[PDB]
Design a protein around this ligand. Sequence first.
Ligand SMILES: O=C1N=C(NS(=O)(=O)c2cccc3ccccc23)S/C1=C\c1ccccc1Oc1ccccc1
Length: 363
Amino acid sequence: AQILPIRFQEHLQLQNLGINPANIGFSTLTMESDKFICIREKVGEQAQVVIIDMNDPSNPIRRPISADSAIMNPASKVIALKAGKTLQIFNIEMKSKMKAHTMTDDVTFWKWISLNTVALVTDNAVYHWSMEGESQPVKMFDRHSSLAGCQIINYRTDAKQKWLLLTGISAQQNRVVGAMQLYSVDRKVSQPIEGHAASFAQFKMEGNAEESTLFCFAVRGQAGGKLHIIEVGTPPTGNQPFPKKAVDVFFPPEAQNDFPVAMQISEKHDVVFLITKYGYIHLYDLETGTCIYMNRISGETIFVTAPHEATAGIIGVNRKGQVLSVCVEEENIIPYITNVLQNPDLALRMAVRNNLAGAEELF
Ligand SMILES: O=C1N=C(NS(=O)(=O)c2cccc3ccccc23)S/C1=C\c1ccccc1Oc1ccccc1
């Protein structure tokens, strides 16, 4: 068989839209959802910000805007801008300031965690800040000492905002070591975890009426590459617990310095997408951890990812400016699982879930 369980797509080449490759990187380019990319560029002496609307990519909007960091809202024409310790949320459509706040501590990382809330990470704490109303940032938890001095690379929550996860990395010798802090809002407890990339997911087990809240993380530490899928906290009333899964994360012999950097989980397909530093993608079944597919999909590091809503896939930007995505190929995944993976248990479970499109309708 020459069929794949995935479809790879190239959506854009940012260098073809007038972006300097020097600005295609984590400190200057943000992609908080699949709807926009925002780039900060200094051209001559002038600070400029560029917004690429992914529905209208050939018409980037570029303006002289001074900001140390810029993150578009996941859905609205709303942008958060930082300069020093002062933060602003700005309504672009209405050319009007929504909210502003001056922090005491420097915000070293920030990210939209929902359609209306931005998370703020300082050296010692994490806050949530609504874009609505008058409310100021609210401290969610204090940072755990295991993340001290890390470079923060991600912050994310489960859908219900009851489980909060901060992820950093640090250099030790010639290694890149991942440190995570998982915080339970209900329990007011943190747990340190050695991890490089992670995501949450909602999964409805066979036999259960209510979805389980799953936490998936991957790491490459002293025991090698490992992926874990675990239910966090107490199951919903009436549910059976999700049995913890643990599987190997493979790296080939020529990739001893590769490690996980990003994860997204398909809401529709119950598949984990894992991206590595060297530009590999792995697919894993969320229920079992079974590895479905691995391949190198990018010749450059992919430094930012988001869910790709249209395909329930993953979209990312690599360092040369290729905007790429991977999703399940809904017609070919079960054939691939049947004849290449030769995993009929998975083939059957996937068909029973019945979340793969088949046979086009008339409207
Ligand atoms: O020059 C301008 N270009 C704008 N484009 S945008 O699409 O709304 C727009 C807004 C925010 C971020 C953007 C990033 C990339 C591309 C366009 C952006 S808003 C604007 C000036 C402005 C408008 C309202 C209130 C204040 C404004 O600036 C001032 C700053 C300091 C002091 C006085 C004014």
